Amino acid sequence: AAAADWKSRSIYQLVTDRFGRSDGSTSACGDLSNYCGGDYKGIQNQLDYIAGMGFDAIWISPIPENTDGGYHGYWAKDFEKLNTNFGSADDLKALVTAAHGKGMYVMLDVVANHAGPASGGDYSGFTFSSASNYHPQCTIDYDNQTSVEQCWVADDLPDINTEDDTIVSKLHSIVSDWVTTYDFDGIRIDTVKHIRKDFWSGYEEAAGVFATGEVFDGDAAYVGPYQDQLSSLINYPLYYAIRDVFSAGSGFSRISDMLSTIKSNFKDPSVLTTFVDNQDNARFLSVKSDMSLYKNALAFTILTEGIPVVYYGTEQGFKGGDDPKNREVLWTSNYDTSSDLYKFIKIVNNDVRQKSDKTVTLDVDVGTNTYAFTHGKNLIVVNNYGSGSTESVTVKVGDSVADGTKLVDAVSNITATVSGGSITFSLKDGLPALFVPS
Ligand SMILES: C[C@H]1O[C@H](O[C@H]2[C@H](O)[C@@H](O)[C@@H](O[C@H]3[C@H](O)[C@@H](O)[C@H](O)O[C@@H]3CO)O[C@@H]2CO)[C@H](O)[C@@H](O)[C@@H]1N[C@H]1C=C(CO)[C@@H](O[C@H]2O[C@H](CO)[C@@H](O[C@H]3O[C@H](C)[C@@H](N[C@H]4C=C(CO)[C@@H](O)[C@H](O)[C@H]4O)[C@H](O)[C@H]3O)[C@H](O)[C@H]2O)[C@H](O)[C@H]1O
Ligand SMILES: *[C@@H]1O[C@H](CO)[C@@H](O)[C@H](O)[C@H]1NC(C)=O
Ligand SMILES: [Ca+2]
C-alpha cells in the first residue's frame, strides 16, 4: 500500500518472539535475552484482541534466519531463509491473510545495513558469505556521518558493503521478494542513518510499498532530509518532546516548538510515525510511574498529526526498563481486554480516532500545563499536572466549534459547552479529555 493508504492507520508494534505462543502457555520466560517462543499463529490467534483496541495495522519483527540469540530478528544470517523459531512459511502467509480479512495491514521490519555477528569471521551460511562483502570492522564515531555509515553498529554487526552494485541488487531483491511473497503492505526500515542516504530511494522502490525509516536521532534538521528518499520516518524528534512534557514536566511550548521544527524540516509531517515507546527505550512507566501522565502522553501520541504506533504491552501496563527488560512476554497477561490501559486505548484509538481522511489542527491552545488540538471534529485536551489533579482548565476551541456546542469527554464523561470561544472544566484524576460534540 502507498502513503495515502497509510495516513489514517494506527499501528500495533509487536516483537514476534514475545507476543503470543501457539501452545497457549501463560508461563513466564526465564531469559529475556534469548528466544521465549513467540510465533505467527500466536499473533493470528489474537487479531481480535489487537483490532479491539482500534489498531488496523501491525508491525512485526524482521523475518529472516538469524545468528544465535537473534530473538528480535535484527541479526540476519541468510536473508532468504525464514527464522524457524517464528513458524512456517504457511503460518506467516496465514497471519497476513487473516489480518487482510479483518481490513488490517501488516508492516515488515527490514534490515539492509548489517548481518548478525559471525563467530571468528566465519561467514558460513550467510547470504553475504565472504569477509570482502562487508566494510572493514571499526567502531562508529557518531559525530562523523561517514563513520556512522561505514563502521559496524554495536562494533560487532558486520556492515554490508552497500557501495558494491551486486550487493545493492541483492538487497533490492531480498526486500522485493519478502514483500511480494508474503503480501506485506508496508515496511519499517532499520538502521537508516547507517547507509548513505541516496541508497534509500532505490531500496523503497524495490520494496514497492510505503516505508517508514528508523533514523534514531532527536535533531529534526538531521532526520528531515531522509524524507527526500523515504516516504516516512519514525518520529524520534517528537518522541523526545513527548517524553520531556509527560515524563519530565516540561511545559507544552516544548511540544509546540517541536511541531514547528518538524514542519520546517520534513516535507510531509502527516505520514511520520508517532510513538512514545519502542523496543530500544525503557518503557514510559519505568521512567514516570504516573498512569494519568501516561494516558495523556498516549492520547497525544495516538491523535496528533502523523501515523501512530503503540508498542505491544502498553495496554497491559508493562513497565520494563532498558533492553531486554522492555521486551517482556505478553502471554502472562492472558490478553485481558478489561485491563485499565486496554479499555483506555480502545476509547482513544477505536472510538475517538478518525479511521479515514484524518484531519488534525495543532496548537488550538498552547498552555504551560495544558494543550488543546482538534482531531476530526473532536477537541482533544491533554495536560501534565499528574495523577489526582482536579484543576480547572480553560481552553480555546478553535475555528470549527460553535458557541453553544455541547461537548462530552469520551474518557471521563465530563460535559462542557462552548461559551465565548472557550470551554472550562475540571480535570478528573489528571486525565486527558477527548471532547466529542453531542
Ligand atoms: C539501538 C539503536 O542504536 C543506534 O542508535 C543510536 C543513535 O544512532 C545515536 O545517535 C544515539 O541516539 C541519541 C540521539 O541521537 C539523541 O538525539 C538523543 O538525545 O539521545 C540518543 C541516545 O544517546 O544513540 C542511539 C542508541 O545507541 C542505531 O542508530 C539505531 O539504528 C539502533 N536501533 C535499531 C538497530 C538495531 C540493530 O539491527 C536493533 O537492535 C538489535 O541489535 C542490538 C545490537 O545487537 C541489540 O542490542 C542488545 O543486545 C546486544 C547483544 C547488547 N550488546 C551489544 C552492544 C554493544 C554496544 O552497543 C557492544 O558493546 C556489545 O559487545 C554488543 O554485544 C546490547 O547492549 C543490547 O541492547 C538489540 O536488542 C536488538 O534489538 C534495534 O532494536 C533497532 O531498532
Ligand atoms: C570519518 O569516518 C571515516 C569512516 O570511518 C574515517 O575513514 C575518517 O578518517 C573519519 N574522519 C576523521 C577526521 O576521523
Ligand atoms: Ca553501514
Side-chain angles (χ1 to χ4, degrees), residues 147-342:
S147 184
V148 172
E149 296 166 1
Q150 295 295 309
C151 290
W152 288 25
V153 174
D155 190 41
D156 70 353
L157 299 179
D159 201 58
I160 293 164
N161 182 15
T162 49
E163 289 64 69
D164 175 86
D165 284 347
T166 300
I167 291 175
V168 170
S169 288
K170 186 65 179 186
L171 292 169
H172 288 184
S173 286
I174 287 161
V175 70
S176 181
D177 294 345
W178 284 337
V179 169
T180 58
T181 295
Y182 298 104
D183 197 27
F184 295 114
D185 306 287
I187 60 175
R188 177 269 187 186
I189 305 178
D190 195 59
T191 36
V192 167
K193 70 165 54 178
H194 295 281
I195 307 174
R196 56 187 174 80
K197 173 180 307 149
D198 60 348
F199 169 94
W200 289 117
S201 59
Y203 186 82
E204 179 174 356
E205 177 167 5
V209 295
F210 176 72
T212 194
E214 185 229 16
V215 178
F216 194 141
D217 205 286
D219 178 358
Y222 176 88
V223 182
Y226 288 88
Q227 201 175 27
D228 290 345
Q229 300 282 328
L230 291 176
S231 298
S232 170
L233 290 306
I234 298 277
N235 203 340
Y236 262 103
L238 193 54
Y239 167 77
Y240 295 107
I242 296 170
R243 288 301 193 90
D244 285 344
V245 167
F246 295 107
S247 74
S250 292
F252 275 93
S253 64
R254 172 64 167 132
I255 279 171
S256 58
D257 288 351
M258 182 55 67
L259 294 168
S260 175
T261 300
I262 289 160
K263 183 178 179 178
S264 293
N265 284 288
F266 289 84
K267 64 184 205 162
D268 189 357
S270 74
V271 294
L272 304 180
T273 45
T274 322
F275 69 102
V276 66
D277 292 284
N278 68 27
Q279 79 285 5
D280 297 332
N281 289 277
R283 293 183 184 254
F284 183 103
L285 291 169
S286 78
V287 179
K288 182 69 183 174
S289 190
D290 182 311
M291 185 61 73
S292 297
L293 288 170
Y294 194 27
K295 287 174 173 177
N296 279 280
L298 287 164
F300 180 79
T301 295
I302 292 164
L303 297 175
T304 196
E305 180 173 34
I307 298 165
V309 183
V310 175
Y311 186 52
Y312 84 104
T314 297
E315 70 282 8
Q316 300 301 328
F318 283 8
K319 62 178 179 178
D322 297 339
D323 172 11
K325 295 181 182 185
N326 58 354
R327 297 108 182 261
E328 307 100 308
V329 299
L330 188 60
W331 52 80
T332 56
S333 76
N334 203 40
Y335 307 96
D336 183 6
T337 63
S338 299
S339 190
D340 176 15
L341 284 165
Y342 189 104

Side-chain angles (χ1 to χ4, degrees), residues 19-20 39-50 58 90-99 102:
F19 179 87
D39 61 19
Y40 293 125
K41 194 59 60 163
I43 304 165
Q44 193 184 333
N45 286 349
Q46 308 299 338
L47 289 173
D48 287 355
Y49 168 88
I50 294 170
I58 57 172
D90 283 348
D91 282 1
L92 178 53
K93 290 176 179 185
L95 167 62
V96 175
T97 298
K102 279 139 146 53

